[PDB]
Amino acid sequence: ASAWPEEKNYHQPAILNSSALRQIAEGTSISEMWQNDLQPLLIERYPGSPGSYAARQHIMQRIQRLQADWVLEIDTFLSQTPYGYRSFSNIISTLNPTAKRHLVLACHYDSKYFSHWNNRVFVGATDSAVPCAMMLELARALDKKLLSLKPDLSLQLIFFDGEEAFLHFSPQDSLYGSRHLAAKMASTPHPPGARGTSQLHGMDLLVLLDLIGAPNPTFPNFFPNSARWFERLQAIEHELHELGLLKDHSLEGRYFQNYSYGGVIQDDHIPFLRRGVPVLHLIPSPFPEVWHTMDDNEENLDESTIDNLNKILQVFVLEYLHL
Ligand SMILES: [Zn+2]
């Protein structure tokens, strides 16, 4: 009976020194992300729409162009909705699919369905086009390091479809792609051939990004079983700050603050959390003021905050992976 699914409990980061921290800060490009990864996603893309198809193609092509050996899988399924049976497609991008353990970064790539209203279209810029582009930018910026992976531990990106309710949130109308994928992963032996362990035992940590891109986010430390990873984000933010590697940033207005939050936020981590996967939920509290309005658009995004968060997240992921 291997104890391998316990390794994530003892796993420690390999901390980057100052010079490596400067190298990561310099190797990410907020303007290249903006033009190449973000803008093509700033389109209507509710499930089943032609924009959901265009978003999925864009996400797959951006990953396919990279040197690291990503394996793309489209997980397509039917679910009942308030509009009847519909099809949804999660995107999963994995380095070393047979590696036993993965660090998982995730967001939702659908946009909430709304009728056009006075010629305005909801594009969910923070929710979650920006998280999607941050994951693509991280894949691009870290591509030479990730190529080296070609701890039996690697990296996986999930872009969930159907996170949003077609109406308002209810247990049967929301989290379509995550409820499906969590169930599918919990019932899939892993590594291949295993008798008793599932792809969920293999998920060291689910890092779910959502509602990112507004000014002054504050992420609370939601869960005791990922609290020590939340502390790593605080330490990385603090050290990048002290090195002069963040922009328009102060420690009084730091993003990763010392405070917990007792309540439940409904989001794509829920079906994983309820099956015992550790989650680091990178959603701010309070939500962006533009949340679920037509003003959640490109013009209300805060470029230097996204840039700073790309740096902190890329550093977190290298340190976790010992790269
Ligand atoms: Zn939303």
Curated annotation (Swiss-Prot):
It holds the Pfam family Peptidase_M28. Keywords: Acyltransferase, Disulfide bond, Glycoprotein, Metal-binding, Secreted, Signal, Transferase, Zinc. Disulfide bonds join C107-C132. Changing H281L: Reduces activity by 87%. It is found in: Secreted. Changing E163D: Reduces activity by about 98%. It comes from the Eukaryota. It is an enzyme of class 2 (transferase). Its EC number is 2.3.2.5. Changing Q266L: Lowers activity by approximately 35%. Glycans are attached at N17, N258. Responsible for the biosynthesis of pyroglutamyl peptides. Has a bias against acidic and tryptophan residues adjacent to the N-terminal glutaminyl residue and a lack of importance of chain length after the second residue. Also catalyzes N-terminal pyroglutamate formation. May be involved in the N-terminal pyroglutamate formation of several amyloid-related plaque-forming peptides. This is Glutaminyl-peptide cyclotransferase.
